[PDB]
Each structure stands twice: as structure tokens, then as C-alpha cells.
Design a protein around this motif. Structure first.
Motif, mmCIF file in Angstrom:
data_model
loop_
_atom_site.group_PDB
_atom_site.id
_atom_site.type_symbol
_atom_site.label_atom_id
_atom_site.label_comp_id
_atom_site.label_asym_id
_atom_site.label_seq_id
_atom_site.Cartn_x
_atom_site.Cartn_y
_atom_site.Cartn_z
ATOM 1 N N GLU A 1 15.199 -10.750 1.276
ATOM 2 C CA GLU A 1 16.398 -10.567 1.975
ATOM 3 C C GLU A 1 16.128 -11.295 3.339
ATOM 4 O O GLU A 1 15.246 -10.931 3.996
ATOM 5 N N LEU A 2 16.837 -12.196 3.809
ATOM 6 C CA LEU A 2 16.749 -12.606 5.252
ATOM 7 C C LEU A 2 17.811 -12.082 6.024
ATOM 8 O O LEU A 2 18.916 -12.399 6.595
ATOM 9 N N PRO A 3 17.480 -10.701 6.265
ATOM 10 C CA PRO A 3 18.193 -9.700 7.531
ATOM 11 C C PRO A 3 18.609 -10.796 8.623
ATOM 12 O O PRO A 3 19.567 -10.379 9.162
ATOM 13 N N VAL A 4 17.587 -11.492 8.945
ATOM 14 C CA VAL A 4 17.893 -12.628 9.708
ATOM 15 C C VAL A 4 19.208 -13.384 9.356
ATOM 16 O O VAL A 4 18.995 -14.230 8.592
ATOM 17 N N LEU A 5 20.158 -13.248 10.277
ATOM 18 C CA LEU A 5 21.418 -13.839 9.844
ATOM 19 C C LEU A 5 22.481 -13.826 11.067
ATOM 20 O O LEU A 5 22.474 -12.873 11.789
ATOM 21 N N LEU A 6 23.237 -14.677 11.259
ATOM 22 C CA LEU A 6 24.171 -14.900 12.329
ATOM 23 C C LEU A 6 25.334 -15.913 11.713
ATOM 24 O O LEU A 6 24.956 -16.282 10.641
ATOM 25 N N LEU A 7 26.175 -15.657 12.319
ATOM 26 C CA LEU A 7 27.709 -16.351 11.980
ATOM 27 C C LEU A 7 27.997 -15.837 10.519
ATOM 28 O O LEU A 7 27.355 -15.522 9.637
ATOM 29 N N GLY A 8 29.350 -16.189 10.037
ATOM 30 C CA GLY A 8 29.919 -15.833 8.847
ATOM 31 C C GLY A 8 31.227 -16.713 8.681
ATOM 32 O O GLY A 8 31.408 -17.553 9.571
ATOM 33 N N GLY A 32 23.123 -5.771 10.697
ATOM 34 C CA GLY A 32 23.966 -5.200 9.602
ATOM 35 C C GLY A 32 24.028 -5.933 8.448
ATOM 36 O O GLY A 32 24.044 -5.542 7.333
ATOM 37 N N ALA A 33 24.506 -7.061 8.712
ATOM 38 C CA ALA A 33 24.978 -8.285 7.566
ATOM 39 C C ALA A 33 23.318 -8.824 7.174
ATOM 40 O O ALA A 33 22.428 -8.410 7.715
ATOM 41 N N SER A 34 23.493 -9.672 6.106
ATOM 42 C CA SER A 34 22.343 -10.321 5.473
ATOM 43 C C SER A 34 22.590 -10.991 4.427
ATOM 44 O O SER A 34 23.290 -10.958 3.732
ATOM 45 N N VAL A 35 21.760 -12.072 4.026
ATOM 46 C CA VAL A 35 21.697 -12.872 2.878
ATOM 47 C C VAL A 35 20.759 -12.860 1.866
ATOM 48 O O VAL A 35 19.554 -12.320 2.408
ATOM 49 N N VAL A 36 21.089 -12.547 0.801
ATOM 50 C CA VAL A 36 20.193 -12.167 -0.293
ATOM 51 C C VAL A 36 19.756 -13.676 -1.050
ATOM 52 O O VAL A 36 20.725 -14.381 -1.456
ATOM 53 N N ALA A 37 18.519 -13.877 -1.466
ATOM 54 C CA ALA A 37 18.028 -15.060 -1.959
ATOM 55 C C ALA A 37 16.917 -14.701 -3.028
ATOM 56 O O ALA A 37 15.854 -14.245 -2.503
ATOM 57 N N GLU A 38 16.741 -15.363 -4.320
ATOM 58 C CA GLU A 38 15.935 -15.101 -5.315
ATOM 59 C C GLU A 38 14.914 -16.117 -5.173
ATOM 60 O O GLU A 38 15.380 -17.521 -5.155
ATOM 61 N N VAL A 39 13.486 -16.005 -4.853
ATOM 62 C CA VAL A 39 12.655 -17.118 -5.016
ATOM 63 C C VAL A 39 12.120 -17.567 -6.208
ATOM 64 O O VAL A 39 11.603 -17.371 -6.948
ATOM 65 N N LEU A 40 12.643 -18.961 -6.441
ATOM 66 C CA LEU A 40 12.560 -19.914 -7.698
ATOM 67 C C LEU A 40 11.114 -19.809 -7.861
ATOM 68 O O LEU A 40 10.657 -19.852 -9.075
ATOM 69 N N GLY A 41 10.303 -20.392 -6.826
ATOM 70 C CA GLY A 41 8.885 -20.428 -6.896
ATOM 71 C C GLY A 41 8.299 -20.906 -5.610
ATOM 72 O O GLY A 41 8.859 -21.170 -4.834
ATOM 73 N N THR A 50 8.262 -22.839 -0.378
ATOM 74 C CA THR A 50 9.076 -21.726 -1.422
ATOM 75 C C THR A 50 10.348 -22.011 -1.476
ATOM 76 O O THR A 50 11.316 -21.867 -0.568
ATOM 77 N N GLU A 51 10.794 -22.620 -2.785
ATOM 78 C CA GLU A 51 12.107 -22.844 -2.915
ATOM 79 C C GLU A 51 12.956 -21.575 -3.415
ATOM 80 O O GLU A 51 12.560 -20.822 -4.032
ATOM 81 N N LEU A 52 14.157 -21.531 -2.658
ATOM 82 C CA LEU A 52 14.812 -20.245 -2.844
ATOM 83 C C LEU A 52 16.409 -20.659 -3.563
ATOM 84 O O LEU A 52 16.666 -22.001 -3.693
ATOM 85 N N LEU A 53 16.834 -19.513 -3.719
ATOM 86 C CA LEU A 53 18.493 -19.772 -4.239
ATOM 87 C C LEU A 53 19.141 -18.772 -3.622
ATOM 88 O O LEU A 53 18.805 -17.388 -3.919
ATOM 89 N N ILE A 54 20.157 -19.010 -3.007
ATOM 90 C CA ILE A 54 20.811 -17.979 -2.216
ATOM 91 C C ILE A 54 21.745 -17.135 -3.124
ATOM 92 O O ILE A 54 22.278 -17.490 -4.257
ATOM 93 N N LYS A 55 21.995 -15.865 -3.123
ATOM 94 C CA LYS A 55 22.529 -14.983 -3.886
ATOM 95 C C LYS A 55 23.890 -14.443 -3.393
ATOM 96 O O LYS A 55 25.160 -14.949 -4.222
ATOM 97 N N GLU A 56 24.034 -13.843 -2.284
ATOM 98 C CA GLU A 56 25.179 -13.213 -1.539
ATOM 99 C C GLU A 56 24.946 -13.205 -0.223
ATOM 100 O O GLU A 56 24.123 -12.619 0.129
ATOM 101 N N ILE A 57 25.943 -12.984 0.473
ATOM 102 C CA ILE A 57 26.033 -12.673 1.901
ATOM 103 C C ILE A 57 26.638 -11.215 2.259
ATOM 104 O O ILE A 57 28.031 -11.198 2.569
ATOM 105 N N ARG A 58 25.842 -10.410 2.395
ATOM 106 C CA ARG A 58 26.492 -9.050 2.615
ATOM 107 C C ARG A 58 26.509 -8.841 4.333
ATOM 108 O O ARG A 58 25.454 -8.775 5.037
ATOM 109 N N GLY A 59 27.779 -8.923 4.504
ATOM 110 C CA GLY A 59 28.112 -8.735 6.166
ATOM 111 C C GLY A 59 28.955 -7.725 6.623
ATOM 112 O O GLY A 59 30.008 -7.934 7.046
#
Ligand SMILES: [Mg+2]
Ligand SMILES: [Mg+2]
Ligand SMILES: [Mg+2]
Ligand SMILES: [Mg+2]
Ligand SMILES: [Mg+2]
Ligand SMILES: [Mg+2]
Ligand SMILES: [Mg+2]
Ligand SMILES: [Mg+2]
Ligand SMILES: [Mg+2]
Ligand SMILES: [Mg+2]
Ligand SMILES: [Mg+2]
Ligand SMILES: [Mg+2]
Ligand SMILES: [Mg+2]
Ligand SMILES: [Mg+2]
Ligand SMILES: [Mg+2]
Ligand SMILES: [Mg+2]
Ligand SMILES: [Mg+2]
Ligand SMILES: [Mg+2]
Ligand SMILES: [Mg+2]
Ligand SMILES: [Mg+2]
Ligand SMILES: [Mg+2]
Ligand SMILES: [Mg+2]
Ligand SMILES: [Mg+2]
Ligand SMILES: [Mg+2]
Ligand SMILES: [Mg+2]
Ligand SMILES: [Mg+2]
Ligand SMILES: [Mg+2]
Ligand SMILES: [Mg+2]
Ligand SMILES: [Mg+2]
Ligand SMILES: [Mg+2]
Ligand SMILES: [Mg+2]
Ligand SMILES: [Mg+2]
Ligand SMILES: [Mg+2]
Ligand SMILES: [Mg+2]
Ligand SMILES: [Mg+2]
Ligand SMILES: [Mg+2]
Ligand SMILES: [Mg+2]
Ligand SMILES: [Mg+2]
Ligand SMILES: [Mg+2]
Ligand SMILES: [Mg+2]
Ligand SMILES: [Mg+2]
Ligand SMILES: [Mg+2]
Ligand SMILES: [Mg+2]
Ligand SMILES: [Mg+2]
Ligand SMILES: [Mg+2]
Ligand SMILES: [Mg+2]
Ligand SMILES: [Mg+2]
Ligand SMILES: [Mg+2]
Ligand SMILES: [Mg+2]
Ligand SMILES: [Mg+2]
Ligand SMILES: [Mg+2]
Ligand SMILES: [Mg+2]
Ligand SMILES: [Mg+2]
Ligand SMILES: [Mg+2]
Ligand SMILES: [Mg+2]
Ligand SMILES: [Mg+2]
Ligand SMILES: [Mg+2]
Ligand SMILES: [Mg+2]
Ligand SMILES: [Mg+2]
Ligand SMILES: [Mg+2]
Lengths: 101, 138, 113, 59, 117, 154
Positions: free
Chosen positions: A34-41, A54-63, A92-101
Motif C-alpha cells: 500500500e502506497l499510503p504515500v499519495l497526493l491528488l485525485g 486518509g487516501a492511498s493506492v493499492v498495488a500488487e507486486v508482480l515480482g 520491483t514491478e507493480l500492478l495498481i489495484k485501486e485508489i482508496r481516497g
RNA sequence: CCGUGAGGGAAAGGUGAAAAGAACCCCGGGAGGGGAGUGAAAUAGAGCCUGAAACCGUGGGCUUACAAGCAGUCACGGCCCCGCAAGGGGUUGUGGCGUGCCUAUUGAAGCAUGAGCCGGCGACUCACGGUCGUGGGCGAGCUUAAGCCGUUGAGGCGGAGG
RNA sequence: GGUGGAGCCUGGGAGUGAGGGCGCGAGCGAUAACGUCCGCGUCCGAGCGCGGGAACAACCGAGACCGCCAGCUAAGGCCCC
RNA sequence: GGGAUGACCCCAGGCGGUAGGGGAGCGUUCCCGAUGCCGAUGAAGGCCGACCCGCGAGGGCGGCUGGAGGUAAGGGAAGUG
């Protein structure tokens, strides 16, 4: 949606289902970061302050991978000074899942 | 990393009246305009600035004693082939040259810059010959 | 198909013959025959000789009809040079090279059935 | 071995660029009006013989 | 036992010759000239693999400016606003918004000039 | 350079020729020239402390004994030099060429019989040396050879 | 081959298992080739195993006649080529940045030295002493030299001597 | 006080014994010299690696292990180039 | 410092460089290893590669050429780049 996260000293414009590689995260393919580190929407969540606390984006690590080799050659004239080093930035390659804001 | 590349876009024209403007002060703005550094599409290696039609050249303002004292030099490869032409004479004849020379010496010097200058039309004015639109600016 | 020739070790400088060979590249056999027939160079003779041999091959060996023929390809490669002494002034002995060329002409056919 | 000598070896490009003019030009011929043959204009070729024009052999 | 050169030199030579593919004239056909051209390239790449970072700090700034200039303020101020409005994020790289989200950008300007007015 | 068949005459004058300075086509340089620090005949033999040789001989054997791979003998049924015969006694003894064997015995008849076996290295007792013990897998001495060995260990 | 002479002193090895070394036909004065034929192979065809590099060509792909350069490098873009894709390979139109290599010097891009380019040869060794260090053996001690006996890639003995 | 690629002792291997510019204190000089000779310092040398100074060893900034299409600064800058 | 001696982990500093000193490695010829092991289902060498390993010298694997040799781990010598 659309967001602006901060990971590995840099900061990228992430979105729904995609992603490139970021620095080397000490996680594991078999995990979710989770990249709690997040700005703008997409609807303007401009972090009036550092982060959007409060917001954050979720990403699954492909490898994790090892960048294409770069070569660092140092040469100094009239001094018989040469140096050849090979370089590969771990990634480390990621895959973005969803932006919880 | 994010892309940026604007990609082939139709260029916009611009009409300017130099009536009482002082060159150098005017020239600079025609330059930024020529290379289009006034738009977030700015790309160093491509001609993508506005075209600029300048009318009412001549009758251009210049301060101090720059008339009679500002000299334009031109050198033929021959011996004693250095010509000195004072500002007054350039305005008196070839007046658009005064504004072109000025602008020219304010554009990057390579192939591109050389090409942006072809994008700048100056006339002794008033009235010009381009009915390809022409947003007037200040 | 095509019919090759080649005349190895002719004994005329390559640069000199590449010059007449380039005249006929791409022309028809008939047309190329007239060119080196009136081309004022020592080379012509050789080129003509190999050109005519390729023609004689294209028919007899791979039956192609003396008509359709045209020089599809032709180039001249360099063979071993013959080194020779040339007495210069003040004792000096210079080495003049009597070059040698490998002339090659390959033919083909134009129209069809 | 004397006085002026070339300063540098002329590069392959520079050498070849000079010969841009050494290209040969085709002999100029025309069809002979008396026989089926190619020969240079304003010249008496063997083939035909020139409406009499002191010609080679023929029976 | 005698240890002649054998094959070791041709190999080292043709190694370098490969990194030289593409170079002009002898700088790609002769080991000596190639060896030299490479020293330089080795160095430029390193030297340049830095100017690059600056070449974009550059680009972005020329744009961010050009863009926020259509809104009534200059690069100086804008950055001061942001940096002062605590929204110290944007990051010249991402203020590419000026090209993609002209509104998400504008909002950012208002916030900027507000942090100063 | 002093041993090649060339003359020591200076090839060309020292100065003014436009050529490099040279002397006699016998110096390192020049293809047909001489060799710089080339090899010369020399004796690579040094005197090794006898105590060290002794220790090692034993150590070599001991080590072979520890693996139980040693095997001394009293005599050989198949005596009278004749491979077939040794190959016979071989079975009986447990030797079939699965392992290389160092067979040391003062009996020339036995010696003659083994020898030709690809897996057999044969020696006279008073020739027992470390290198051989190690190059083979199994060591086979007779009692009369195990003695000479003794008269040499301390 | 050089020199009057004493004397100096090169270069140059390889078809294939087997000549089976290419009858004969075709172009040509010949040379040389094209077929045919031999052979596992003929780009093993005869100064013929392999046959690199410099060098010379033919064909193709990208690209160039308003540009200016230690010839590259970083960045975008166009065209061509791979693979399903992401991605990658070739080329180079603009933009940015850029003072060859070696040597020698207080200081060299230097208008100081050396090098036409490529291939191959080309320079800190060996012997015996010495002095440190170090891996071992034995240590109030350690160790043999010549030579002798043995082997025929087997080691022993030998205390003069140090 | 001060744990530093500080010091001290013993031994093995050196290289160096043409230095140069800048500042300051003297001599020489003619308080001329990109001069010369000493003194402290500092840079170059060996940092012809990077920024500024138009360009430019030694002036101002600053000691380059490698990577990043992130950030703050230094000198110097912020009209166009 | 962990010390389960895991030579792998966190902590702390450092890592421009000529003359030079020191420490690790790559490759070449040859010897033991070899009466072994690879090899015509192709040795050595050559020509390619956008792939794999290594910081680097290199080591792999693959396609073509080549047509009879090559030589592991582990060590030993030296006409060794
Ligand atoms: Mg330099
Ligand atoms: Mg120097
Ligand atoms: Mg003469
Ligand atoms: Mg004479
Ligand atoms: Mg010549
Ligand atoms: Mg050419
Ligand atoms: Mg920046
Ligand atoms: Mg910035
Ligand atoms: Mg002699
Ligand atoms: Mg002699
Ligand atoms: Mg003499
Ligand atoms: Mg000369
Ligand atoms: Mg010899
Ligand atoms: Mg004579
Ligand atoms: Mg056959
Ligand atoms: Mg063969
Ligand atoms: Mg053979
Ligand atoms: Mg051959
Ligand atoms: Mg070739
Ligand atoms: Mg071509
Ligand atoms: Mg022009
Ligand atoms: Mg053009
Ligand atoms: Mg460029
Ligand atoms: Mg000198
Ligand atoms: Mg020096
Ligand atoms: Mg020069
Ligand atoms: Mg020079
Ligand atoms: Mg000198
Ligand atoms: Mg030199
Ligand atoms: Mg010269
Ligand atoms: Mg060479
Ligand atoms: Mg060479
Ligand atoms: Mg010694
Ligand atoms: Mg010693
Ligand atoms: Mg110290
Ligand atoms: Mg000391
Ligand atoms: Mg002195
Ligand atoms: Mg001095
Ligand atoms: Mg002095
Ligand atoms: Mg000093
Ligand atoms: Mg001094
Ligand atoms: Mg000083
Ligand atoms: Mg003074
Ligand atoms: Mg001085
Ligand atoms: Mg002074
Ligand atoms: Mg002095
Ligand atoms: Mg220093
Ligand atoms: Mg400096
Ligand atoms: Mg310089
Ligand atoms: Mg500077
Ligand atoms: Mg500067
Ligand atoms: Mg440092
Ligand atoms: Mg700032
Ligand atoms: Mg400041
Ligand atoms: Mg260092
Ligand atoms: Mg040998
Ligand atoms: Mg063997
Ligand atoms: Mg087979
Ligand atoms: Mg070999
Ligand atoms: Mg040597």
C-alpha cells in the motif's frame, strides 16, 4: 480514477489497472503493498499539506527484476587511468489495484 | 516517467503592431513567441512556436542617441570591406531589417533557430498580406 | 534463372575495367553488345569477351534464348598484383604494381510466356 | 620524395567523392539506313558501306 | 614451454570493434581508432547520464511556467505558493498536469496564489 | 642474441636515413632476431628434508590404511608371472579392477604377472614412494615388503 | 642475391582416404570460364586444409546538396526490421553537451614527440649468494655435499662439511 | 577536551630530490616582467572530473563508488540567446 | 557486533587520484589428474548473437563454418596478455 503516489524517492501518476517498475521494494511477489504515500485525485484531492492523510493506492507486486545493464566507463587522459564497471538497477514491478481516497 | 510529446499540431499565427514599441523590448517577446516557450507543449527539438507577422515596423521606438550612434556592421571577405551603417539609415531604407536583425540575434543559432526566423514576417506596415487568421497581441 | 561467366586474372587494372563494366550493367545483351563495340577503351575487349561467353552459356547450358538476355549482374573483383621494379633516379628502386582483375558477368531473362 | 607532400591520407569518402565525375558516357550510335546495324553518326561503318561510299567487301 | 599470443589478441580486438559498430570510417574499422573513440563515449555517457536529470528539471520548469503564466503568475511565485501552501509535492516532473489536467493544474495555482494572498 | 647465426655488423648507419636506429639483426627485436629471457637448461631438483620424506611415506600409507584400503599379503597362490594367474589370485584377494591398485612386492614373478593390468601399478618394496601410493586407490604389499617399509619409518 | 675480397645472407612446408588431377560438349587465339564427370566435401580444382584483419567490390535497408566538425554521447521524433505483446535491432532529422591516443612536462587539443592501416614477433628472467616475510619438518638442534647402491619418470645410503 | 585511514615503536617495498600559479611578509629588479629567491597558506601538480567566471591547470563554488524522467542549495544568476 | 561462526544478517563511518605500496581475480602454453573423460549425432580455430553469469579481465548457451582433435574439478611450472 487517477492519483499521484510517492514511492522509492520518486513519485508516479498511477491509475486503475496498470503499472511499470518502481525502486526495489522489500516485499514479496506473494504480497500486496500500500502506497499510503499519495497526493491528488481524479476529482481534485490536492494534498493541501504533504500527504492526503486518509487516501492511498493499492498495488500488487508482480515480482522483482534487474534492469538492463548500463556501463560506467571512466577515462583520464595522459595518466593511464581507465575503469569499467557494469550496472543493473534492481527493480520491483507493480500492478495498481485501486485508489482508496 | 511520463511521456510529454505533443505531436504534430497546426501552428497559430499572430499579428503585432509595433507602432511605438521600442525594439529589443519588443524583439524579445517575438522570440519567445517564435520558439513558443509560452505554451506547455514546449519541445526543444521541434519548431512549434507561433508564426509572427509584425506590421508597422519602421516607426519603431529606440531610446538614447541610438540613431546616429547605433551602427550595423557588415563584412565582405575583401580588404577594407567593413561597412558601418547607422540606425537612421537602416530605418530610412530597409526598415524591416532593423526589427529582423534585432530578433534574429535573439534566437538559438543552429538549424532550428535558423528555421524559426523563416517563421517571422516583418512589414513596413500598416496592413500585411496574410489572411490565415491572425490573433493580434500586445 | 541466370548464366554466369567470369574471366580470372585478366591483367588490366580493376578501376580501369570497372569503368566499362558499369556501362553495360542492366542493359540488354543486344544493346550491351553495341556499347562495348564502340566504347573506346582497352577494357571493352575483355568485357565483351566474357559477356559473349555468358550469352553462349545461357543458351547452350541452361537454354534461355538469346533474346530475353540482359546483364542482371556484373562486377569486377581484384586479383593478385604483379610487383615490378621501376628504376628511379639516385639508386632508388620503386615497386610498380601491374594489377589484375577478375571480370564477372551474370545474365538473365526479361519477359515470360 | 620531394617538397610538397600530402598532409593526411585522403579518407575513403573523400577519395570516392572526387570520382563522382569519372563515370563514363555511352558511345553515341544510330541505326544505319542501309543495313540493320548500329554505328556512330556521320561515319562510314563496315556493315552497310554507304550508298557506294568506298566500302569493304561484298558479292 | 612457449606461450605465444595465439588467439587472445584477435579476440580482445574484435570485442572492442563490436562496441564500435556504427562509428564513422576507421573509428569503426581499426582497433586503435575505435579504442580511442570508445574512451570518449564511455565518458560522455557517464557525464550525460547526469545532465539528463538536469535536462528535464529544465523542460518541466519551462512548461510549468508557460502554463501557469496563462493564469496570471510566474514560475517563481507558483513554486513559492505551493512550497508555502505546504503542498510541497507537485514535483516538476508531475506538474506535467499542465498538459493533461489543465483544471487539476489550475486548482493548484489558485491554492498557490492563495497561499500568498 | 649472442647465440644466433647472424653477424654483429651495424645494419644501417646510426644517423640520417629516415629509418629507426639499429645495429645487428641479432638483438631481441627483428623477427629472425634472438629471444630475450628464453628458457635455458636447468636442474629443477632440490633436497627435501629426509624426515619430511619419511613422515609423508608413512602418512601416505596410514591414510590408505584408515580407509581399510590397505592389504598386505603372505604369498600369492598364482605365482610364476602370468597375468591370467594374477587375475586369478586377484579375485580371491578382492581385486577386480574396480579400483586402481599399487602392488608392491619383491617377487619378480608376481610383478611380471600384474604389470600389464591397466589398473595395476607395480613396484619393488625398496621403491615405495609417496606419489605412487596416492595415484592409486588400493595398496597391496607382501609381508617381506611391509618390512622394508618398516626399516624405513621411524 | 650482395661485395672486387675477407665476408654478408633470404624467402619458400599442408589437395584428397584414394589422382579418382576433371573424357567430352559449349564461348574464347589463349587465359579463363559454363556444363558434364570424380569425391563424403570441389567456396578440398591444384602453390588447392582451416582460411582472421587491413584493403577492393556488387546488391539491399536508413540517411544526406543552408549547412560548421576529436565525429561521439544524452533526449525526443521519422522510416525499415524482428516478436502475439511488452519489448528489441538497424538508420539518423532536430535539440543539448563535448579540446584525439601515447609520451614528456610546472603546463599539451595543442602549432611539442611517436604512429598510414591491419596481422603476426617484441621488453623485469635465470644461477649462485644475501636480507626480510611466509607454508611446513625437527628442534639443544637442523642439514648434508661429492659420491655409492636402486630404479629407468622409485628412492635410499652418504656426517667431510655448514 | 579531542577514537582519527590520529599518534608512537620495530621491520619489508617505494617513489621523490626540474615544481607551478594565487595571497601575504622580505631581498633582487626599475616595489617592470606569465621575472627571481626565501618565509606561511592554499590550490594545480595527481581534482585538464563537476558549477560559476564568454572561452581558460591553479580566481569564486565544491572533494566525482554506481543508478534515478524526484527534492534543497553553493558561487553566479533570474530581457532574448 | 550477530556470535547457534549462518563468512549471512542489522549498526557506524569511509570509497577523486599521478609516482608508488598492498590485496584479490580473468585469460595463454605446458605437466600431474589421463590405460580417464569429451569427440564424425562433429575436436581445435573462424563468423554471428538483441540471451544467461561476473563489478571487470571473462565464462556460458545457440546458429553458421570447420573436418580431427580437445581435455573438469584440484593443483604444479612459465618464452604468458
Ligand atoms: Mg582530454
Ligand atoms: Mg599530467
Ligand atoms: Mg628515371
Ligand atoms: Mg645508377
Ligand atoms: Mg604505394
Ligand atoms: Mg566508397
Ligand atoms: Mg529541477
Ligand atoms: Mg528543481
Ligand atoms: Mg652467417
Ligand atoms: Mg654476435
Ligand atoms: Mg664490430
Ligand atoms: Mg620518415
Ligand atoms: Mg630464432
Ligand atoms: Mg659483386
Ligand atoms: Mg556427386
Ligand atoms: Mg577441406
Ligand atoms: Mg586434413
Ligand atoms: Mg583454402
Ligand atoms: Mg575478408
Ligand atoms: Mg553499396
Ligand atoms: Mg541562410
Ligand atoms: Mg536541406
Ligand atoms: Mg548531436
Ligand atoms: Mg621530452
Ligand atoms: Mg610531473
Ligand atoms: Mg594538429
Ligand atoms: Mg601532435
Ligand atoms: Mg624532445
Ligand atoms: Mg611517444
Ligand atoms: Mg610524422
Ligand atoms: Mg599493428
Ligand atoms: Mg598487431
Ligand atoms: Mg635465492
Ligand atoms: Mg629470498
Ligand atoms: Mg597518514
Ligand atoms: Mg617503513
Ligand atoms: Mg631542486
Ligand atoms: Mg625551476
Ligand atoms: Mg631549481
Ligand atoms: Mg609547493
Ligand atoms: Mg621553490
Ligand atoms: Mg607555493
Ligand atoms: Mg615581486
Ligand atoms: Mg615564476
Ligand atoms: Mg610576479
Ligand atoms: Mg633554486
Ligand atoms: Mg589536491
Ligand atoms: Mg579545476
Ligand atoms: Mg583543457
Ligand atoms: Mg572551471
Ligand atoms: Mg566555465
Ligand atoms: Mg569522495
Ligand atoms: Mg529552489
Ligand atoms: Mg545567494
Ligand atoms: Mg581509489
Ligand atoms: Mg607447443
Ligand atoms: Mg594423459
Ligand atoms: Mg555423421
Ligand atoms: Mg592446443
Ligand atoms: Mg615475452
Amino acid at each position: 480514477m487517477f492519483a499521484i503516489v510517492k514511492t522509492g524517492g520518486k513519485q508516479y501518476r498511477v491509475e486503475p489497472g496498470l503499472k511499470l517498475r518502481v525502486e526495489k521494494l522489500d516485499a514479496e511477489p506473494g504480497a500486496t503493498v500500500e502506497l499510503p504515500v499519495l497526493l491528488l485525485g481524479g476529482e481534485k484531492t490536492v494534498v493541501g499539506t504533504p500527504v492526503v492523510e486518509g487516501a492511498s493506492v493499492v498495488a500488487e507486486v508482480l515480482g522483482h527484476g534487474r534492469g538492463k545493464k548500463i556501463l560506467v566507463s571512466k577515462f583520464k587522459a595522459k595518466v593511464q587511468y581507465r575503469r569499467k564497471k557494469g550496472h543493473r538497477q534492481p527493480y520491483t514491478e507493480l500492478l495498481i489495484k485501486e485508489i482508496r481516497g | 516517467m511520463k511521456t510529454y510529446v505533443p505531436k504534430q499540431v497546426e501552428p497559430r499565427w499572430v499579428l503585432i503592431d509595433a507602432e511605438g514599441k521600442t525594439l529589443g523590448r519588443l524583439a524579445t517577446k517575438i522570440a519567445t513567441l517564435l520558439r513558443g516557450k509560452h505554451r506547455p507543449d514546449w519541445t526543444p527539438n521541434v519548431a512549434m512556436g507561433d508564426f509572427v507577422v509584425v506590421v508597422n515596423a519602421d516607426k519603431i521606438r529606440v531610446t538614447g542617441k541610438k540613431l546616429e550612434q547605433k551602427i550595423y556592421t557588415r563584412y565582405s571577405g575583401y580588404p577594407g570591406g567593413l561597412k558601418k551603417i547607422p540606425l537612421e539609415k537602416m530605418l530610412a531604407t530597409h526598415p524591416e531589417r532593423v526589427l529582423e536583425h534585432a530578433v534574429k540575434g535573439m534566437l538559438p543559432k543552429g538549424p532550428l533557430g535558423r528555421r524559426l526566423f523563416k517563421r517571422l514576417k516583418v512589414y513596413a506596415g500598416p496592413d500585411h498580406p496574410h489572411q490565415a487568421q491572425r490573433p493580434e497581441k500586445l | 534463372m541466370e548464366a554466369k561467366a567470369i574471366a580470372r586474372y585478366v591483367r588490366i587494372s580493376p578501376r580501369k575495367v570497372r569503368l566499362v563494366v558499369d556501362l553495360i550493367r542492366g542493359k540488354s545483351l543486344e544493346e550491351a553488345r553495341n556499347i562495348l563495340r564502340y566504347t573506346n577503351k582497352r577494357g571493352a575487349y575483355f568485357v565483351a569477351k566474357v559477356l559473349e561467353s555468358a550469352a553462349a552459356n545461357a543458351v547452350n547450358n541452361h537454354d534461355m534464348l538469346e533474346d530475353r538476355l540482359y546483364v542482371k549482374a556484373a562486377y569486377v573483383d581484384e586479383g593478385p598484383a604483379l610487383k615490378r621494379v621501376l628504376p628511379r633516379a639516385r639508386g632508388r628502386a620503386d615497386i610498380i604494381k601491374k594489377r589484375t582483375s577478375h571480370i564477372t558477368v551474370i545474365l538473365g531473362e526479361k519477359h515470360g510466356k | 620524395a620531394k617538397h610538397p607532400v600530402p598532409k593526411k591520407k585522403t579518407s575513403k569518402a573523400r577519395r570516392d567523392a572526387r570520382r563522382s565525375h569519372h563515370a563514363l558516357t555511352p558511345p553515341t550510335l544510330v541505326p544505319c539506313p542501309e543495313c540493320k546495324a548500329m554505328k556512330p553518326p556521320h561515319t562510314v561503318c563496315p556493315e552497310c558501306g554507304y550508298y557506294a561510299g568506298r566500302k569493304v567487301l561484298e558479292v | 614451454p612457449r606461450a605465444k599470443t595465439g588467439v587472445v589478441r584477435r579476440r580482445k580486438h574484435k570485442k572492442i570493434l563490436k562496441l564500435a559498430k556504427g562509428y564513422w570510417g576507421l573509428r569503426s574499422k581499426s582497433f586503435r581508432k575505435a579504442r580511442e573513440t570508445l574512451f570518449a563515449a564511455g565518458n560522455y555517457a557517464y557525464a550525460h547520464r547526469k545532465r539528463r536529470k538536469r535536462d528535464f528539471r529544465r523542460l518541466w520548469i519551462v512548461r510549468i511556467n508557460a502554463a501557469c503564466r496563462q493564469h496570471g503568475l510566474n514560475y517563481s511565485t507558483f513554486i513559492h505558493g505551493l512550497k508555502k501552501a505546504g503542498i510541497e509535492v507537485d514535483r516538476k516532473n508531475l506538474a506535467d498536469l499542465a498538459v493533461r489536467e489543465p483544471q487539476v493544474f489550475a486548482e493548484l495555482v489558485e491554492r498557490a496564489k492563495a497561499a500568498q494572498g | 642474441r649472442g647465440e644466433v647465426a647472424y653477424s654483429g655488423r651495424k645494419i644501417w648507419p646510426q644517423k640520417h636515413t629516415g629509418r629507426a636506429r639499429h645495429g645487428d639483426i641479432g638483438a631481441p627485436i627483428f623477427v629472425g632476431g634472438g629471444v630475450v629471457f628464453g628458457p635455458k637448461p636447468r636442474d629443477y631438483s632440490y633436497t627435501l628434508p629426509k624426515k619430511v620424506r619419511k613422515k609423508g611415506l608413512a602418512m601416505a600409507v596410514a591414510d590408505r590404511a584408515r580407509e581399510g584400503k590397505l592389504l598386505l599379503v603372505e604369498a600369492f597362490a598364482g605365482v610364476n608371472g602370468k597375468t591370467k594367474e594374477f587375475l586369478a589370485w586377484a579375485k580371491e584377494a578382492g581385486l577386480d579392477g574396480s579400483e586402481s591398485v599399487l602392488l608392491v612386492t619383491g617377487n619378480e614373478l608376481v610383478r611380471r604377472a600384474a604389470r600389464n593390468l591397466p589398473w595395476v601399478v607395480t613396484l619393488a618394496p625398496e621403491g615405495l614412494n609417496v606419489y605412487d601410493i596416492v595415484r592409486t586407490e588400493r595398496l597391496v604389499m607382501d609381508l617381506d615388503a611391509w618390512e622394508v617399509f618398516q626399516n624405513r619409518i621411524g
